[PDB]
């Protein structure tokens with residue numbers, strides 16, 4: 001069984017790093033703005049069932065994503081919205097991504113979660129947890145704060161995606 005999870009959010013929030021961290025088990029140290037359609041896969045076992053989790057690493061840049069959104073939303077099973085904890089603007093963008101999702105989803109059942117990334121940059125954090133939690137609550141989504149680069153030692157990125165499956 002294929003479980004398609006799309007990862008949506010502003011350019012530079014770390015979507016490519018999160019998806020690569022989950023699928024490959026390590027941080028990608030060479031990344032550039034994602035262009036077009038990229039996805040990566042990982043075979044997992046949940047409760048005895050072998051499942052192929054397929055993470056769609058969407059483009060944040062308008063030029064590269066504009067004609068791709070119906071590919072992103074084709075046969076989607078879950079949605080992960082990402083902001084950068086060090087960039088308040090990326091958090092302010094979220095209502096726009098959430099509305100795009102609303103317009104493209106048919107099934108009212110599909111899980112959506114909110115992820116703040118780059119929590120390792122403690123000194124540079126701009127989005128307080130309480131603010132993000134209040135917003136997540138308003139949209140009936142759970143909130144996770146994590147790091148694609150460093151939080152693993154806090155037991156977080158794997159758990160966030162696994163729990164969706």
Ligand SMILES: Nc1nc2c(ncn2[C@@H]2O[C@H](COP(=O)(O)OP(=O)(O)NP(=O)(O)O)[C@@H](O)[C@H]2O)c(=O)[nH]1
Nearest residue numbers: 011012013014015016017033034060118147148149
């Ligand atoms: N310190 C830190 N840097 C991170 C983390 N995640 C990503 N980065 C860095 O943030 C930058 C953007 O990462 P990237 O995954 O390419 O972003 P993106 O959301 O895929 N961008 P695009 O939408 O344009 O493809 C990179 O320089 C990457 O090294 C993180 O958890 N911690």
Ligand SMILES: [Mg+2]
Nearest residue numbers: 015016033034
């Ligand atoms: Mg990318």
